[PDB]
Every structure is written in C-alpha cells, then in structure tokens.
Design a protein around this nucleic acid. Sequence first.
DNA 1: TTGACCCTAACGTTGCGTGATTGTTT
DNA 2: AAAACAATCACGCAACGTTAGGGTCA
Lengths: 109, 107
Amino acid sequence: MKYQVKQVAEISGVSIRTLHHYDNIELLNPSALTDAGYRLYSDADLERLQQILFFKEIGFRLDEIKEMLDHPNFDRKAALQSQKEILMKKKQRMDEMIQTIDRTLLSVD
Amino acid sequence: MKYQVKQVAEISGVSIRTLHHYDNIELLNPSALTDAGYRLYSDADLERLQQILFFKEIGFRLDEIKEMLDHPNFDRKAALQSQKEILMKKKQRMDEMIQTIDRTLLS
DNA sequence: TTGACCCTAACGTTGCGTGATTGTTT
DNA sequence: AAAACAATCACGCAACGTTAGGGTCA
C-alpha cells in the first residue's frame, strides 16, 4: 500500500536525499507520515514522481515541473517546444565552442 | 600604466563585480593596491584577463583556468581536446533530450 | 540489545548579480 | 561639499551530495 524512502528510491532510481529535497520544495510531498515522522508514499505519489522525473529528462527545472504539475491547465505543447528551442540554442552554443577549439588546435598537432 | 576597476572592466567586457570575484578566488590579483585599497591592474594583468576570458569561452571553469595559468607546464593540447570531447558528449545529451521531446510531440 | 532504517540540520558546490552601507578623490 | 568612483560584506540562485548527530522499529 505505502512505501518509505528506501523503497521509493529503489523503485525510481533517485536518492533518498532527492525525495527529501523534493519534499522540502513542495515538489513531491509524501501522502502520509508515521507518528515517528517517517515519510510514506502512495502509488499516486509514485506516478507523480515518474512524471516529475520525465520532465527532468527534457531539461526542465523543479520550479517549471512544479508549476506544470500543480497547474495542469498550463499548455504543454508550447512548453515542450520552447524547451526544445532552448535546448537547440544550448546545442548551438556548444558548437561555436567546439569550433573555437578546433580553430585553435591548428598549431603543432 | 595602471588601471582601476571601472576601466579594466570597460576594456574587457566583464563587470567590476567580476574583477573582485576573480580577485578573491586568487584567479586575477591586481598588480598593485593603493593606500586606500583601490586596486590597480597592469598591462600584464590585462593580458592575463584575456587569457582567462579565452578559456572561459572554451567552457573551462575558473578552477581549471586558474590551474592552467598558474602552471604553464600543464600540456594544453590534451586539455583542449578533453574539453572538446566533454563539449561533444554534452551536445549528444542535448540531442537525446531533443529527440525525446520530438518523440513526445506526436500529438 | 542490535542492526537496519528514518529524520533534521546545514555546509559545499559554480560564478557572479544585486543591493546595502561606507570610505576616497585618477 | 558634492559627484564619481572604490571597498567590504553577504544574501540569492539549482539541485542535490555529503557528513554529522541522533531517534525508531514495516
């Protein structure tokens, strides 16, 4: 029924420290707590975690992920594209950086 | 032939705040200090600042840049390559992420 | 009692931006 | 006697990693 850090960390691949941090940030708040304070996660919490984890792969930030999960109305298409555009530019920057390196490695190679 | 922050900053493009930081980090230390504490950079300090800015463009971090300027024995060739390689892998990760977005935009 | 497991601090990391407050004078 | 310019704090940002010390018991 419920899961505690060790298990959630194992099922999802993230660290316990991560679960805490996501808890402190209000990104992912456990569904329950034991009298002793132990965090107890529900299957729903696990879906939520998978989604925040997926948006993480696309390069979004915890705040963006948060605002998108807490506010579903927020159009996702435009976000997925803009994020793409942002990514593409980051890629373009690195290219210019690599050129600068090559354009520099031409001297006693 | 000495310059104070306003100038050096204006001549190099970086901010005065940057110059201070680079000073605290021991990356770029002013050639001279004024009695009142104003720092004065020499033409040499300016060359050093340019070198710094180059490596900064290639993507190196202050520590790496520092360690390279303070020890000119460090083979620069391999450094420029390894850095190139690192930049490439980053490019690749960027690609996979873009693919994943596209692979999701099918709707 | 004892592992195995959980918690809360709180500093470390990268590179300055942005005030706030205050001294100096190229 | 003011306008510019310089200085030293020190908090803020992204996302956890990593001890350090100390309860709990699925």
